[PDB]
């Protein structure tokens, strides 16, 4: 059933869909292209916070620790750390900024503490995502060419990294339950999984978007009465200009919710 109507749904959308579940109250997975590769966009800034929490585990006051940020350091899309130029802001503000508001200059920050893109894939590999590659700095790793390999994932990758990082022993517990914390205070998912998904249930996110048409979602969720569950809704279109479509997210999920 949910295999034909994400198939139908694809169709009709103009573009490639990726779909992953995970269910915990089983551990049974969904997947639609859940082995093909898709630019991640912003949802990669979930492995670079992450990774910094992971440090933060043998540097106790490291999220305390300032970074500067200079007129030089802004790019594309800095809501918060256009406020703090010539100033500073922690690692926790700039990962709290980065993950709650999908902030670029702070995103760019929280690679270079983790020494570049590859440091971030390193990171991904110690916790056995073997798939995740982080090539490129903000904001060119949204360029999201078809075929490209560069800054790309799985989401069956994603969705086994997202749940072993938010419910699983990847981190921490103080550090686990910091980046649930930023994920259900994320400002920019309404639109996307969180619209198909029943109102009683709760949920954080990561979104991303990127040339085109790339939209994507990642969410950690707590259905009304069942285990919780990891979701990832991949989507890419031909053109290069072509328009987001968060409602696509929102299908993808509710046909999902439906078929639990
Ligand atoms: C070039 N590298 C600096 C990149 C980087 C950045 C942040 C974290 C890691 C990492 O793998 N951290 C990690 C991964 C798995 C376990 C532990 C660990 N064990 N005990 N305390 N921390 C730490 C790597
Ligand atoms: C400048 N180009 C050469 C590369 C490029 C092309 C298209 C979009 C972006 C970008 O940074 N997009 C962007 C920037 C910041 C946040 C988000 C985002 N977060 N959640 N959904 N979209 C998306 C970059």
Redesign the pocket.
């Known amino acids: 059933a949910v295999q034909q109507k994400l198939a139908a749904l694809e169709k009709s959308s103009g573009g490639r869909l990726g779909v992953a579940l995970i269910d915990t109250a089983d551990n049974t997975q969904v997947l639609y292209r859940g082995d093909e590769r898709f630019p991640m966009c912003s949802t990669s800034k979930v492995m670079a916070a992450a990774?910094?929490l992971?440090?933060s585990?043998?540097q106790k006051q490291l999220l305390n620790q300032p970074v500067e940020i200079k007129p030089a350091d802004l790019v594309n899309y800095n809501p918060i750390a256009e406020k703090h130029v010539n100033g500073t802001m922690t690692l926790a503000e700039l990962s709290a900024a980065a993950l709650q508001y999908s902030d670029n200059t702070a995103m760019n920050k929280l690679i270079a503490?983790?020494?570049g893109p590859?440091?971030?894939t390193?990171?991904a590999?110690?916790?056995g995502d073997e798939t995740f590659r982080l090539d490129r700095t903000e904001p060119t790793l949204n360029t999201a060419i078809p075929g490209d390999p560069r800054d790309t994932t799985t989401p069956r990758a994603m969705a086994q990294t997202l749940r072993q990082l938010t419910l699983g022993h990847a981190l921490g517990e103080t550090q686990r339950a910091q980046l649930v914390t930023w994920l259900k205070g994320n400002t920019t998912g309404a639109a996307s999984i969180r619209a198909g998904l029943p109102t009683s249930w709760t949920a954080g996110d990561k979104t991303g978007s990127g040339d085109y048409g790339t939209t994507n979602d990642i969410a950690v969720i707590w259905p009304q009465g069942r285990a919780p569950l990891v979701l990832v809704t991949y989507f890419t279109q031909p053109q290069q200009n072509a328009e987001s479509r968060r409602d696509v997210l929102a299908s993808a999920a509710r046909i999902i919710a439906e078929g639990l």
Do not use: P, S
């Open positions: 990774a910094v992971k440090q585990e043998t503490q983790l020494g590859g440091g971030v390193a990171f590999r110690a916790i």
